[PDB]
Amino acid sequence: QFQKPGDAIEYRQSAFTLIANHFGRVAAMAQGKAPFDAKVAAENIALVSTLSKLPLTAFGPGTDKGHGTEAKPAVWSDAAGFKAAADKFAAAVDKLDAAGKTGDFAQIKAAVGETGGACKGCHDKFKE
Amino acid sequence: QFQKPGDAIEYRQSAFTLIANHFGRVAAMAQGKAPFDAKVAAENIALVSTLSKLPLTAFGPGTDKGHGTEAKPAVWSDAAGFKAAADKFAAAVDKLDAAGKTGDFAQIKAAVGETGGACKGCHDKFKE
Ligand code: HEC
Numbered sequence: 330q331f332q333k334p335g336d337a338i339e340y341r342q343s344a345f346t347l348i349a350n351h352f353g354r355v356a357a358m359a360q361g362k363a364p365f366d367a368k369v370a371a372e373n374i375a376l377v378s379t380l381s382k383l384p385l386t387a388f389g390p391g392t393d394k395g396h397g398t399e400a401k402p403a404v405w406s407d408a409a410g411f412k413a414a415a416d417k418f419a420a421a422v423d424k425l426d427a428a429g430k431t432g433d434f435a436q437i438k439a440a441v442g443e444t445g446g447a448c449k450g451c452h453d454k455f456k457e
Numbered sequence: 458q459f460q461k462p463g464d465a466i467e468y469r470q471s472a473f474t475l476i477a478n479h480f481g482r483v484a485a486m487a488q489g490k491a492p493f494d495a496k497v498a499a500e501n502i503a504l505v506s507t508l509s510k511l512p513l514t515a516f517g518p519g520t521d522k523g524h525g526t527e528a529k530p531a532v533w534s535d536a537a538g539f540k541a542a543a544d545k546f547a548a549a550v551d552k553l554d555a556a557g558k559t560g561d562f563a564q565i566k567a568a569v570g571e572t573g574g575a576c577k578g579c580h581d582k583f584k585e
């Protein structure tokens with residue numbers, strides 16, 4: 330779906346930006362920085378879940394260069410490591426999605442922690 | 458929630474990028490440039506619909522300068538005009554959503570044309 334490799338880069342960056350913004354709204358409630366509203370949390374979680382399925386589809390062959398990319402070469406040269414990182418994130422987001430549907434603060438908070446750990450674990454190995 | 462103007466600008470840009478990509482996938486089918494797959498068209502339409510509701514929430518006061526923005530000052534000095542352009546888009550996206558639900562190629566093609574017109578109409582007045 331990307332005509333030029335720059336397109337894949339801008340797409341994945343864009344998806345990550347939207348994920349970070351909506352995930353951050355949920356995290357703010359989990360951290361007690363904003364009052365908890367289960368409906369609003371659920372809406373933001375649903376968006377995170379939808380968006381989470383997008384960026385990791387945009388690291389195809391030849392999408393490694395330029396356009397302000399912060400993807401490390403290891404994304405392509407340690408593809409197994411990158412896939413493990415992606416799968417850990419998908420598993421955490423599944424739990425987050427389930428938590429959003431229950432409206433249980435504790436379950437949401439636990440899943441925010443797991444999800445955030447997956448963001449960081451991938452970035453440590455694969456993002457500048 | 459945007460902490461600084463840069464955050465609003467990056468968010469809206471990011472959402473428009475994702476919108477353009479998924480909309481373009483549908484458009485390619487409608488224009489007779491790719492085979493028609495109604496399920497895939499519906500999935501991309503549903504994403505467009507979800508996404509369409511995001512960027513126009515990120516043009517608050519003071520988000521008019523810097524950070525690579527291409528928003529024209531008229532976004533804020535003709536707020537009613539910008540809102541009219543946004544509402545025209547939203548109405549077109551409603552029709553695109555309806556078309557995704559039916560799977561009707563002709564209805565999808567009509568809605569792609571209308572939606573595209575709404576992108577262009579807003580850009581002509583409000584985007585550098
Ligand atoms: C690997 C499996 C990742 C997971 C899981 C998450 N992110 Fe990440 N992210 C990853 C890479 C390789 C990059 C660089 C993309 C590029 O081509 O430049 C990023 C980038 C981001 C960004 C910056 C986007 C930009 O500046 O344009 C953000 C804000 C971001 N990622 C956030 C983020 C969050 C909140 C995550 C968990 C919910 C997350 N990412 C997971 C790789 C991976």
Ligand code: HEC
Nearest residue numbers: 470473474477480526527528542543546575576579583584
């Ligand atoms: C006004 C009501 C708009 C409608 C409807 C659409 N877009 Fe637009 N778009 C608009 C503005 C004011 C801007 C500039 C945003 C900024 O702060 O820079 C944009 C930008 C884009 C972009 C570029 C994004 C980037 O990465 O910088 C794209 C790709 C884009 N818009 C596409 C697009 C499509 C496909 C639309 C219809 C489906 C559409 N936009 C509607 C204003 C408006």
